[PDB]
Write a protein that binds this ligand. Structure first.
Ligand SMILES: CSc1[nH]nc(N)c1S(=O)(=O)C(C)C
Length: 330
């Protein structure tokens, strides 16, 4: 089997991407944030505290003839941005882009933090990291991908995120029309539960490439590119007037600037992030100070190749017995 679904930016900045997902019988379609940095599929639901729902579409398990309470199971997750959610668990039929999994754990939110409430466009998350990170207790549950894997034509999924445009998540096949040149594959460590890999270095604009190992995670659920302070300082030093602002919470730059590109290494290959991809617009409406798309990972404890990086590439998440990651230009 295979699946193919379009993923769409939630706003004009590509803060996140939503992908329609069918849950239950008859289908209830919710727009979920596919997150390769976590491993829970959770949804706004009929059980979510009413004051914490503000425009989201909810899953109502009582209206699904295939929903079953997973008795005794609870979940609770905290994300890198400080947001969180928790609740109980049902199993139900879940389909993405034509690919169907029966008995998928669907984690029903009883509580969500303010950031989730305030984002009317995201109805929940679909985790695509390794199932060892799944938070369901006392019986850990598998991700949608892990459940689907054996039925897929090939044990892979791909992320093809758009810049200010829709893109695609494919399951079970590699669309050879969706990228240019060749795909370069690189080793993955699953030791922390992430799609963790090591970039071979970077360049800023038309500058020389610096060969240096940068260990980080491929994370579709993080908006920006978070890298070591040395790398980030070298980037922003090429933008007149750019500075790190503790009050704003990162690097800002004059909105009048033209940003340089940023290149990262994948083995001997190179992925180029255009300057425009690094512009996250005015810090507040009407401001002439703009927020940068490359930020320091110091304090986070891990480097994160978030959407800013991933949307510059066609990315293969290879879930073979020894997982690997592939990157192509597009
Ligand atoms: C990607 S977060 C962001 N992008 N553009 C902004 N203005 C913001 S913010 O959250 O208001 C803050 C970090 C400046």
């Amino acid at each position: 089997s295979t699946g193919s679904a379009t993923t769409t930016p939630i706003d004009s900045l590509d803060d996140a991407y939503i992908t329609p997902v069918q849950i239950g019988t008859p289908a209830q379609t919710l727009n979920l944030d596919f997150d390769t940095g976590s491993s829970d599929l959770w949804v706004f639901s009929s059980e979510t505290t009413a004051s914490e729902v503000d425009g989201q579409t909810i899953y109502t398990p009582s209206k699904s003839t295939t929903a079953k309470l997973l008795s005794g199971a609870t979940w609770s997750i905290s994300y890198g941005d400080g947001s969180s959610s928790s609740g109980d668990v049902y199993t139900d039929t879940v389909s993405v882009g034509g690919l169907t999994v029966t008995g998928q754990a669907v984690e029903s939110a009883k509580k969500v933090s303010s950031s989730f409430t305030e984002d009317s466009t995201i109805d929940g998350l679909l985790g695509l990291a390794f199932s060892t990170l799944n938070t369901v207790s006392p019986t850990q549950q598998k991700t949608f991908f892990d459940n689907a894997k054996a039925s897929l034509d090939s044990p892979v999924f791909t992320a093809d995120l758009g810049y200010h445009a829709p893109g695609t998540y494919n399951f079970g096949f590699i669309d050879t029309t969706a990228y240019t040149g060749s795909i370069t594959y690189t080793a993955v460590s699953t030791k922390q539960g992430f799609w963790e890999w090591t970039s071979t270095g970077y360049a800023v604009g038309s500058g020389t490439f610096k060969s240096t190992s940068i260990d980080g995670i491929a994370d579709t659920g993080t908006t920006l590119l978070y890298l070591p302070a040395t790398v980030v300082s070298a980037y922003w030093a090429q933008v007149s007037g750019a500075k790190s602002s503790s009050s704003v919470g990162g690097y800002v730059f004059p909105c009048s600037a033209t940003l340089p590109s940023f290149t990262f290494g994948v083995g001997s290959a190179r992925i180029v992030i255009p300057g425009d991809y690094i512009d996250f617009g005015p810090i507040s409406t009407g401001s002439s100070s703009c927020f940068g798309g490359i930020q320091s990972s110091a304090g986070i404890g891990i480097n994160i190749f978030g959407d800013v990086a991933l949307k510059a590439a066609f990315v293969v998440f290879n879930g073979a017995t020894t997982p690997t990651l592939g990157f192509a230009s597009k």
